[PDB]
């Protein structure tokens, strides 16, 4: 036997808490990537949101409309292409504010990455500063299903879902994963709290280290 | 202060393991409930599946087709109404086997429960024995969105999604939540393993007692 390594119970609790905050975020992102490909790998979406955007089909007829906010919690829903933002829904209402104006991240990178990932039937996800708030962004190319003739993914439009990590959403997420008082770290010092970075943003999530799930 | 209560470290680990398995299941169920209403609260779905089921639209045109299995992992996708099963897709292929023949649970109960929940814009979920295997079932009424004229939900058809808890899905779910060797309990005794019941089924989930995550 090499011998055991005994650990401080607080160190174990802190390690578990970081593990479960990371898993909460990863699981949220993977669920949202699946949601995005559900809405974007869809022949109807390719017809009505590829090329010219039919806001009547998307918003008035509720095919990509306010429910995505009032039920699914996507504070931002966008269709973008090489010219920029072609459709914008902010908090369930039509908006003229472009995705690029709302984000710290480069939207051309989002467009290109979503186009490439669509080759593997995949979406992309990342963290962003959405108008000064932490958010998870997911994006996937708008393409028809396999019964349709093939298209060139290099020119496909891209659907974007922006999930702002509000105090209420963070508190529910923390409860979902047994984390005590998950919140956006206010100042620059965590002090008594543990914290992690939402990489690609200046935001950090912080929480009180207690025995998680107890 | 009342004074502290010190606990056995293995007892804490066991309590945390039960907490995170229960959260793993609840979060999976809530996600599938959202997925179900994404597909069922949909005017096109009401048109092509609400009464007579158009399998060309659903399967050939991939609006409710094989991707729901090959990407989203739903081993069973059904449309049911007062007459029984109107549409059945098993492992991504059209099937003649009814939902009622596949379940231990009563499908009239599912129809009624979903038709009611739709009044509150909700789906329903439960655990089932799906042809001898543990599964999560979710169901929601097929109804158009609010721009459409009102319909009678009491006569609406119901979409049903069946997520079979295969060994691969269970191992991945367990890893998602820091659980060691999550599996379908083989025999009748867990012995050294922890277990919980999938209520409404004879199935139990079992796992090896470890410090979760860590």
Residue numbers in the entry:
A (entry chain A), B (entry chain B): 36 to 249
From the paper:
Cyclic dimeric guanosine monophosphate (c-di-GMP) serves as a bacterial second messenger that modulates various processes including biofilm formation, motility, and host-microbe symbiosis. Here, we show that iron regulates c-di-GMP levels in Pseudomonas aeruginosa by modulating the interaction between an iron-sensing protein, IsmP, and a diguanylate cyclase, ImcA. Binding of iron to the CHASE4 domain of IsmP inhibits the IsmP-ImcA interaction, which leads to increased c-di-GMP synthesis by ImcA, thus promoting biofilm formation and reducing bacterial motility. Our prediction results reflected that ImcA contains six membrane-spanning domains and a GGDEF domain while IsmP is a multi-domain protein comprised of several domains including the PASPAC (IsmP273-413), GGDEF (IsmP413-585), EAL (IsmP585-865), and CHASE4 (IsmP59-220) domains.
We solved the crystal structure of CHASE4IsmP at 1.9 Å resolution with P22121 symmetry. Each CHASE4 domain contains two discontinuous subdomains: the membrane-distal subdomain and the membrane-proximal subdomain connected by a loop. The former exhibits an alpha+beta fold pattern, which contains a core five-stranded β-sheet, with other helices distributed on both sides of β-sheet; the latter mainly contains a three-stranded β-sheet, which is connected with the former through short α8 helix. The dimeric form is maintained by a pseudo-symmetric interface mainly consisting of several polar bonds mediated by Q51, W55, K96, 97 N, T180, D182, W212 and P247 from either chain in a dimer. Due to advances of computational biology, a putative Fe3+-bound CHASE4 rough model could be established based on in silico analysis. ITC assays demonstrated stronger binding affinity of IsmPCHASE4 towards Fe3+, however, the IsmPCHASE4 mutants exhibited weaker, even no binding affinity with Fe3+, suggesting the critical role of E65, N66, Q69 in Fe3+ sensing and ultimately binding.
